[model samples]
Target chain A: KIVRVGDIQIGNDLPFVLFGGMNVLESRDLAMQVCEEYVRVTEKLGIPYVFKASFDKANRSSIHSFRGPGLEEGMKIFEEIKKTFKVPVITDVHEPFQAQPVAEVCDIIQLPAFLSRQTDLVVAMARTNAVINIKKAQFLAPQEMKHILTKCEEAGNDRLILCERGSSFGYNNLVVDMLGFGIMKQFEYPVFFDVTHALRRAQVTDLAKAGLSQKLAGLFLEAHPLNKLEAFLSQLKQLDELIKSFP
Target chain B: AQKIVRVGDIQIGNDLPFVLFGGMNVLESRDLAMQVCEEYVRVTEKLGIPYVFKASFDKANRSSIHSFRGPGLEEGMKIFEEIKKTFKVPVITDVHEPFQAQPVAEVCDIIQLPAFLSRQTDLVVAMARTNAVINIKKAQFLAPQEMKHILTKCEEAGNDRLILCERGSSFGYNNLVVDMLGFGIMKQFEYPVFFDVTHALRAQVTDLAKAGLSQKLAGLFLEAHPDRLNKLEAFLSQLKQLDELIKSFP
Candidate 1:
């Protein structure tokens, strides 16, 4: 299924769209700075891109933690990115009230994984009539996401996307189930993988695996260092190029 | 670093051949339990694999409130007692709460700690007091190495007969993926380690009322695949050989 968010299109057959941005919107200047770099690199590589950031980190472990700028300030920054970069924006809504306002500015309205099952929030987001990206909950089964989609459809919104962040393995641990990718595809929705949260519980011993064969070496290198952003983007581009050539 | 823990006539450890900790996920009925245990006994006897029957009296952590949770404790123990008397096989069942530990231990050769409750200190203490073989299902959230702490906790309570079982780790939302490498890490602890490969094979749809039934069917489902059983046999043979190979090594 092709999901259109502004001018960009995302789907399984399409080239992967880069929903790249900061974890949270710290400031207008910071949002602009990050979006500029993302646009520059993505445009250079000719990859479809959607700028993503959150206005409120409502469910952070600590209340004292820096949640991005509030909805009003965050929208101003998003509006600036829309006008300046001319790219579609995606951002998460923390409250039911934030849905309409956030949807008005952003191309995609995201349901936070923690709030993914909140029926009222899903209904509110659906009523905005915007493209939705449901972060598949860590505690949920991949096939279980149909209920969320059903909720969106019941509220009269059909343009939906599924995103996979890591799932809860135990306390303070997350595991990216590669097998889940295939299982999630059963819904025929455009699925996206979020690597930011996926990298948190990675262990050092997982990297130092013994008995590396020539065939297995490439898979070992898949967990790229986050510090090397450009290198990561280049690798993404290389993967895209390879997929294009093979297809 | 091999240590054997005896359950009935069976000895389980790194030195021993991999034993079959096989049975249904839940005790649906006494008749069902009898049927399943009889099949397991016949199969293991033919193949000569060490066998222990496993089932849960109550699925305490079921995803849905309405899902079927097997027969209650008294009925389950009656069924387990009957199975033991009839089939003459050792039985294993998990206890969710501390109070159920002693009563369950009386009927069961192994009192398993449900993966979700594996880290509870008080339950560990109570189960340890029963002095039955304790099989700790490694919690999905726990890494392989962290299992040592649970072992330490059990030992601190004066219980040394502990086994570790790995089902599968929670992969990104509602999925589980087994890390084959973690088996080696767990082997470092010298306790008998068992793999619940059946649970690992479940690729379940979320809306389904019962995840356990689908997981239970995975074995029979794979048996229909032409290569599945042969491949499994080859893998098991290799695993047995690997134990000998490791023993031979410096």
Candidate 2:
């Protein structure tokens, strides 16, 4: 199933869309700089793109860890990015109350993996009619994801994207099941692999090859330091083109 | 210099043909335990595989209170003793509490420290002090490198006769993935490394085949229940062939 974000199409066959941005919304100035760079590079490469970042990091391991600007500040930042670049933006929401307000500004409202099971939040996000990107929870089997999809449809939202961040391997590490992408695609919903969170000190290109071979709708990426935009997407675009070339 | 540990007449090492730690989940009854041991011994003897019988007693850690744990320690030790004399093979069982360690280690040749309790200092010392060959299960939440700490802990307690078992690691909620690469990681400790698929039965054949192909495991540990008994011979035949073919590299 193809999903249209403004003019760009996301599905199995079209050119792979890049969901690229920061890990968190540190500040408005930095946010704009990142989005501009992504827009410039993506436009040059002719890659369909959506800017992604977290308005809040609800599952930080430490209590003292920074969780970005609160909902109000984040909404302000997102509004400006969408208006300035005239590009659709993506960001995640943690709590149920933030769903409606976030959906209004963000093109894709992500259901966090940590809170994916919260029915209230699911219902809240679904009612907005905004595109929902459901992060497959680390502990959930790929086959069990239909339940989440069912919950969203029952709540009236059909424009959904399934994102794979990684599954828990042991301790601090996570290993991506390349085969799981096919499992999620069985639902005919656009599936995205979050390459940033799935980092395991292995080759990112290897990850890209596996995800794109499945003809995914997009790749979810976060360039930690801003300078990686030109070099990082250079490699991803090459890999994506090669993969998307196959019949 | 692969380390080989001896139990009765059985020799275990990374290079040696794999050992079988086979038994029911928990000792439901003495009669069934006896029958299971008989079946295990008969099949293993026919296949020329080294065997050790395993069962849990007083599953004080039975996922819930209402669940049926095995019989208490005294009853279980009696069963282990009877099986040891009756089957003439080494036996293995779990010891959760500090006090249960000494008594269990006395009857069972190998004392199992479950992954959940593998980190308890007191329990680790108690099982170690008993001087029985300890089978330490790598916890689901623990990394492969982190297992070195638990391995060092047992050695720190003055016992070096140890075995490392890899049950599948926790993948996501209610899921487990057996990391075949993990066997190579743990094998470097020079202790007998085992692939335990009993707790995580997701990919029984492919997983054990990978472990067998890793070419560095000491054994394969499994639990038989349901209709698994009927399938045991054919299954073991396949695994034994794989293990032999891998070992034939020499």
Candidate 2 per-residue lDDT, tens place, B1-250, comes to 6798998899988889889988988898998888887888888998888999988887776567877877899988998899999888999998888988997888889999988999889999999899899999888878788889998999999889999888766665776665544666677778988877667543334334433433446897877764466567766765676566456543
> Chain A TM-score per candidate?
0.84, 0.93
Model 1 scores a C-alpha lDDT of 0.68
| Per-model i-RMS | 13.4, 10.5
| Candidate 2's DockQ | 0.03
Query: Model 1: residues >4 Å from true position, as ranges?
Result: A60-66, A199-227, A240-247, B1-176, B179-250
Docking quality level of the chain pair in candidate 1: incorrect
The ten-residue window of minimal lDDT in model 2 chain A covers: A200-209
Q: Grade the docking of candidate 2.
A: incorrect
In candidate 2, list every pair of residues with a backbone clash. A139-B172, A139-B173
TM-score attained by chain A of model 1? 0.84
